[PDB]
Amino acid sequence: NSIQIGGLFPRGADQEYSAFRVGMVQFSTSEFRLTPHIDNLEVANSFAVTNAFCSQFSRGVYAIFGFYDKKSVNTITSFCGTLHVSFITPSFPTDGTHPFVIQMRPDLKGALLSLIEYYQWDKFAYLYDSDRGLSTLQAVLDSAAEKKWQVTAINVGNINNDKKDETYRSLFQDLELKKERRVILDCERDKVNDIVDQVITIGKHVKGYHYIIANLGFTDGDLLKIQFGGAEVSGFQIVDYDDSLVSKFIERWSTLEEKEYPGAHTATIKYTSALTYDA
Amino acid sequence: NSIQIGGLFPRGADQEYSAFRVGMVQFSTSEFRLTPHIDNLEVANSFAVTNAFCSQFSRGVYAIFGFYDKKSVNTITSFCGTLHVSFITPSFPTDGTHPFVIQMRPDLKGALLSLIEYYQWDKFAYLYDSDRGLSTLQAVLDSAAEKKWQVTAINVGNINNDKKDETYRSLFQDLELKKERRVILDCERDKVNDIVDQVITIGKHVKGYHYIIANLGFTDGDLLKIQFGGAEVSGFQIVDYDDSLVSKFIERWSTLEEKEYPGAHTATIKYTSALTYDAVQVMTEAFRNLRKQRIEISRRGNAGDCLANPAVPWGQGVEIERALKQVQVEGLSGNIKFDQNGKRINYTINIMELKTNGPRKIGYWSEVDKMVLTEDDTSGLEQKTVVVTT
Amino acid sequence: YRSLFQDLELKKERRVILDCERDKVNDIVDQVITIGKHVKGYHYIIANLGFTDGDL
């Protein structure tokens, strides 16, 4: 039995798509089969998202799936909320409760709170990228009342790649005036990479500083570049690799040729793709 | 040569629509007379927004007008950017340089930071609703970093109205944990007045507290309710009632029956409505200039459905946007001028203080001149009886 | 390398004059980066004419 469903995907999310088809293969059943309607539109154009949404609605799909921008979240909640169409999503959790919005990404902020509670920091800078939503920051501020924290949040995402350089050195130099030893980064994998790189170049990966990477990709991140700096570093993983089902997943995940499923021929996997495959 | 236009007024904004009617009256002209497609739909519902939008798009209206939620900003921005359709709003400005976007609100940010610099504060609470956006928060934090400020921001706006009383008690106690004496407020006027009433009940309207109302319409609130509590209060104002043009506007304003024009029969007015009237003047005179351009643009409902794949926008409106941006004319908020980014520019925002006799100006704020104090001291009232502890 | 500089740490040396060919120069520099011992308080001298030729 064919079962039509939506399949929105941002371009450059190839790993999640490959893993998606892997999900189609692994869990296909004799009783019925899913009928994906793949769509590779950018999430930045909410209007285009509306277009694809009406398109799959024309397809009459019983479900819709894909990533969403904070720019698009209100759109998806509005439409799926209106038409009572379900929409599973890997992306960051909604700041507001909604009907028909299943969401694959666990809330992370409370663990972050407990984490700080363990490290018992009194004061620290807190960089953030807007795109995942500022709500987490709001939370850290709330505790800052209760925990008398003197956090100094600063956005980073506005910066262009073209001048993506001196702004950093000026930034950390600004951090030096407070002589900050402790920062919890909250950025995307790529931004995580560039930031870690600049930290290397300025050499603040030395012992006496500390970092916390606020995402599930803490293992996904290439921390080898800073493993030997002596500064302590800690983060999060939603997917233990020591797990039996996980290791079994790895046994074949390496096997796939990149030509069929690019980005899949690796020892590990982005947690988001894993959320897709689970979804 | 009547010109079809949009009309997206959120429910309960009667004074705004009435002001819109007054705008239709004040600038009606033989060369053309505007043809509103007025609608009353929830601003929060992006779906319905898209519905009416595509409806007027089916009308192929050459211009559109209405507000937008922060939830809906991305909507209308994405539509103006995709369909190359010009639009005007009195809502709070986008954080990005979005094409085909006109906006009546000069950013209150720089004047606010300037004000903070004027009081030379170092520690303060920052209450905020989410609804106008967190841009001011990002800004105040940004300045806070360099200035070694100790921000205490809090999201008051998510609190349920069902018990919009209980939370406040713990809330101000939270301030008392640090004994904050300095509290920026960033909410819409209703929430503002409510919270102020709570300040009354907790009695923190007493002298030695200071307050800041972050809004274009500082006079709109019920300041009289706490005029004599002794706590200092001050805020920004985009609307000078003292202006003779504004004066005459009042002369026609309060006099009108509120039945035909709800929200109009008063001595006061929302800054929003003034932005509306100003938007009417701007659009109207803009097309007046189009007539000088003689660039014919008339078309039927050629636009059809908004889901054309790909949709291909007609470029005459792209020219119309250029015609709009170049407009430079006086309004209720003083001069109106646009950058090609579509933000208002080279404007002015009068500072206001709550003197015991009543609210009062002390200066004005150009974006380029920054803060500008006015001498207006009225030769000093009194020393207000100096406290002498011992 | 890490063992080597760790051995240097016992003397807490702040000052070294490297004397190597440009390739091994670049490699040793990279390792110094990875161990991070190029913060203020250290110093280096590269004993060759290629001091500009190498990346710095």
From Swiss-Prot, chain A:
It is found in: Cell membrane; Postsynaptic cell membrane; Postsynaptic density membrane. Palmitoylated. Depalmitoylated upon L-glutamate stimulation. Ubiquitinated by RNF167, leading to its degradation. Induction: Down-regulated in the pyramidal cell layer of CA1 in the hippocampus by global ischemia. Detected in forebrain. Detected in dendrites of neuronal cells. Expressed in the pyramidal cell layers of CA1 and CA3 and in the granule cell layer of the dentate gyrus. The postsynaptic actions of L-glutamate are mediated by a variety of receptors that are named according to their selective agonists. This receptor binds AMPA (quisqualate) > L-glutamate > kainate. Belongs to the glutamate-gated ion channel (TC 1.A.10.1) family. GRIA2 subfamily. The M4 transmembrane segment mediates tetramerization and is required for cell surface expression. This is Glutamate receptor 2. It comes from Rattus norvegicus (Rat). The gene is Gria2. The chain holds residues 25 to 303 of 883 of the full protein.
